[PDB]
Homo-oligomer: 119 residues x 3
């Protein structure tokens, strides 16, 4: 669910706010089209594609679905007790959190004009 | 709930992204005031008024309430097993999805400046 | 939960829309950094800090957590039947609703450019 994704992010990028990732580029936190602005934005595009695949499971609603994971400080693991939807969503969140940790953050791509940059 | 509304939209307007409707005009996806910018925006205003009416039912929370509906490809139906809140919310979502299918989409009303257009 | 906070606001500031508070300053409805733009924005900053403290309770997710409160027209009370997470979240929402009622609303701080005002 949304809060668990937020906490995963806090596990891997403890210095940045969840808000820095909530409105970046063409895909982070909002938007589903256009050319990704930079590598971080690409991470968000992959995450978006990942959630769309999980939504194919009947009744699977990513932002609302609770799952079992663990952050053993810096390290993320999706636990084996998860159902199909949970496990899928947990995987999507995990991979994105790790993707966000490696990508550089360009302050200029924060809170951009979707009409001007997103195709 | 939010995901079911998203899927209703995908049933009736399969070509557009849910994101195209999430930030349009003065009423689509956000905002509750000002003069609607075009016919599509009017659809969103009617939907907003519809959710406010459903919220009069104790404990009825539109974006969170799950309901029974079906999309038999292009066609939408709210199933008879729904409680009062569910049935109401399902109706609101159904009528808007169909409204969105007929209204033309003006690219210029996407992600507008609420301060500049919304009274 | 989100809808209950919205209703608390409607209890204390019946004249304004929930939307007027959903995108104001650096902290209302979104953003977690920068210098608060005015007293209303400070209310939102305190509310944000309050939710972060409640999130320390295992499994406590503010926007999703349902609680027991009552609005006896103008007056707000968090009922004694709430668990730790509920009671905390209810308190955060109550204090903010009352804070919003006293602070003046500056139309110029609505839907601002986060890049330009938020540090
Ligand atoms: Na690159
Ligand atoms: Na017309
Ligand atoms: Na002051």
């Amino acid at each position: 669910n949304l809060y668990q994704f937020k906490n995963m992010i806090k596990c891997t990028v403890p210095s940045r706010s969840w808000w820095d990732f909530a409105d970046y580029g063409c895909y982070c936190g909002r938007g589903g089209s256009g050319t990704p602005v930079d590598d971080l934005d690409r991470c968000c595009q992959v995450h978006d594609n990942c959630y769309n695949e999980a939504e194919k499971i009947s009744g699977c609603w990513p932002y609302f679905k609770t799952y079992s994971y663990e952050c053993s400080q810096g390290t993320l693991t999706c636990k084996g007790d998860n159902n199909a939807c949970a496990a899928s969503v947990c995987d999507c969140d995990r991979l994105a959190a790790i993707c966000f940790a490696g990508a550089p953050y360009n302050d200029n791509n924060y809170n951009i004009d979707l009409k001007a940059r997103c195709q």
